[PDB]
């Protein structure tokens, strides 16, 4: 498990341990075994400025929020398994560095304003809508299962709920994490890169981004 590639800072910034580090779990993504999650947490604990923040980054009716429904249906059980593994593999003083951040811990008033900006843009701007929708379609085209165009549209909205967390530096339980680790570059991480640079949908950068962009750390075996 090692750093393969870096967006948002230089390699030295990491070795100087400048930043707190989030571990961004894609729940239901088959790479995110408990074993692989534990190895990302191990790596992040050895490179972090202080804290490691574990959270659910994406999900690819008991709540109005899809991320919240995923948090209560599946995220809580995942977090319990992770904690158990951690308490058996790490020392007490290492365990004190780890923060388990639920959707609620991240989606505060300021965060939700950003999501709401994106929802309104999804509704008023048909170029944005179609870009997000074609976005869902390409990933589903890699799946055997099929989806109707109303499901495609609903999945797009779900992406918008997590987009600010990938784009901007947010706090979990009061702790800023400037960087996050993820094992591979994806179409979503490339999209966020352009968004942060104002090279796609520049209105988004104007309206919800803050000149402190989320650093992406590509970490895999």
Numbering used by the authors: 1 to 60, 70 to 230
Paste lines from the article.
The structure was solved by iodide SAD phasing after extensive failed trials of molecular replacement, suggesting substantial deviation from previously determined CDPS structures. Additionally, we hypothesised D58 was acting as a potential active site residue, within hydrogen bond distance from the catalytic serine (S26), which could be important for S26 to act as a nucleophile. Moreover, the side chain of the predicted catalytically important Y167 points away from the active site, removing the conventional hydrogen bonding network seen in other CDPSs. ParcuCDPS structure diverges from the common fold in helix α3 and beta-strand β3, where these regions change direction. In the common CDPS fold helix α3 and α4 exist as a single continuous helix whereas, in ParcuCDPS a flexible glycine residue (G84) provides a significant bend and change of direction, splitting the helix into two. β3 holds another important deviation seen in ParcuCDPS’ structure, as it changes direction (compared to common CDPS fold) at I56 to divide the active site pocket. CASTp38 was used to investigate the pocket volume of ParcuCDPS and highlighted pocket residues which are unique. P1 (shown in blue in Fig. 4c) is found deeper within the enzyme and is smaller and more restricted in size than P2 which sits at the solvent-accessible edge of the CDPS. From these calculations, P1 is predicted to be mostly neutral apart from Tyr55 and Glu174 which form a negatively charged microenvironment, while P2 is predicted to be mostly lined by positively charged residues.
Cyclodipeptide synthases (CDPSs) use aminoacylated tRNA (aa-tRNA) substrates to form peptide bonds between two amino acids yielding a cyclic dipeptide product (CDP). ParaCDPS from Parabacteroides sp. 20_3 (GenBank: EFK64745.1) produces cyclo(His-Phe)8 whilst ParcuCDPS from Parcubacteria bacterium RAAC4_OD1_1 (GenBank: ETB63777.1) can synthesise both cyclo(His-Glu) and cyclo(His-Pro)9. ParcuCDPS belongs to the XYP sub-group of the CDPS family, characterised by the presence of 3 residues: X40 where X is a non-conserved residue, Y202, and P203 (numbering respective to AlbC). ParcuCDPS displays a Rossman-fold common throughout the CDPS family.
